[PDB]
């Protein structure tokens, strides 16, 4: 159990991001597996479970 | 159990990011496995579970 | 059990990052395994679980 | 159990980072195993669990 | 059990880092094993668990 | 007299600007004179004349 | 007299700017004179004349 | 007289700027005169004339 | 008279600045005269004329 | 007269500056005269004229 009384709470917050990306050439070549690129300004909360951001895994057997 | 009374709390917070990325050429070449690139300005909270950011794993058997 | 009374708390916080990255050429070449690059300005909290940032593992058997 | 009364607490905090990285050429060549590069401005708190930042392991059997 | 009364506490904190890295050429060549490079401006707290920053291990059997 | 042959020229150019401004309160109080605020991402060329950006002058007699 | 043959020229150029400004309160109070604030990412070229950016002058008689 | 043959020229250029400014309170109080604040990422070229950036002058008689 | 043949030239260039400024309170109080503050990442070229950056003068008679 | 043949030249150049300024309180109090503060990462070239950066003068009669 969780109780908040009179309380101010911030969980998983992103307040203010300036990003510039200049690229003259970008290439992704993939065979199998996984690639994850460019995950930007991401916020999450999870309760009572696993939680993943920009996670990459090979094949599973 | 958790109790907050009259309390101000910040958990997993990112307040203010300026980013510049200049690249004349970017290449990812992948065979199998995993690649994770460029995860930027990420905030997370997890309760009662595992939590991963930019995790990369090889294959699993 | 956890109790906060009248208390101000910061856990896992990033307040203010200026980053510049200039590259004339970047290459990642991967065969199997894992590669993790560029994880920037990440904040996390985990309660009652494992927590990983930019973790990379080889294959698992 | 944990109790904070009237108390101000900072845990896992990064307040203010200026970074410049200039590279005329960067290459990662990987065969198996793991590579982790560039982990910058990261903050974490973990309660009652293991916690890793930029950890890298070879294969596991 | 832990109690803070009227107390100000800093644990795992980094307030203010200026970094410049100039490289005309960087290469990582890896076969098996693990490589960890450039872990910068990292702050962590762990309670009741092991905690590793920029840890690298060879394969495990 | 000016001549360009086969030539590529950039004069007064702004390619890429990301800006965030957060203010909880802004006030300008002015009595006479001049105030100039917030001039952002401005580009100009002038030929054979004077040119001013965000210039402010008091009264003239 | 000016001549460009086969030539690539950049004059007065700004390619890439990320800016964040956080203010909890801003006030300008002015009586007479001049105030100039926040001139950002400005590019200019002038030929055969005077040129000013963010210039401020008191009164003129 | 100016001549460029086969030539690459950069004059007055700003390629890459990441800026963060956090202020809990800013005040400018001015009586007469001049104030100039915050001029950022400015590029100028002037030919055959005077050129001023962030110049401030008291009154002129 | 100026001549460039086959030549690469950089004059007045700024390539790559990360800046953080944190202030809990800033005040400028001015009576007459001039104040100049915070001039950052400025580049200029002037030909055949005077050139000033962040210059401040008192009154002139 | 100036001549460049086959030549690479850098004049007035700044490639790569990381700056952090933390202040709990800043005040400028001015009566007459001049104040110049914080001039950072400035590059200039002047041909055939006087050139000043962050110059401050009292009143002139």
Residue numbers in the entry:
A (entry chain O), B (entry chain M), C (entry chain K), D (entry chain I), E (entry chain G), F (entry chain P), ...: 36 to 96
Quoted passage from the original study:
Amyloids are polymers of monomeric protein units non‐covalently assembled through β‐strands arranged perpendicularly to the fibril long axis, forming a cross‐β structure. We report that αSyn amyloids display catalytic activity toward ATP hydrolysis in vitro. First, WT αSyn type 1A amyloids bind and hydrolyze ATP in a specific lysine‐rich cavity positioned between the two protofilaments.
To assure that the overall fold of the lysine‐mutated αSyn amyloids had not changed, we solved the cryo‐EM structure of the K21A αSyn amyloid in the presence of ATP to 3.13 Å resolution. In accord, the ATP molecule is found in a different orientation in the K21A amyloid as compared to in the WT αSyn amyloid (compare Figures 2C and 5C). In the K21A amyloid, the phosphates of ATP point inward toward His50, whereas in the WT αSyn structure, the ATP phosphate tail points outward toward the new β‐strand of N‐terminal residues. Interestingly, in the ATP‐K21A structure, there is a small rearrangement (with respect to the ‘normal’ type 1A‐fold) of the N‐terminal stretch (residues 42‐38) in the direction away from the cavity/ATP site. The fact that ATP binds to the K21A amyloids, despite a lack of chemical reactivity, was independently confirmed in solution using the fluorescent analog MANT‐ATP, which has an environment‐sensitive fluorophore attached to the ribose moiety. Whereas we detect over 400 µm free phosphate after 3 h of incubation with WT αSyn amyloids, the mutant amyloids showed little to no phosphate generation during this time interval. The binding mode observed from the docking of Mg2+‐ATP into the closed cavity of the WT structure and the open cavity of the K21A αSyn mutant agreed with the distinct ATP orientations observed in each cryo‐EM structure.
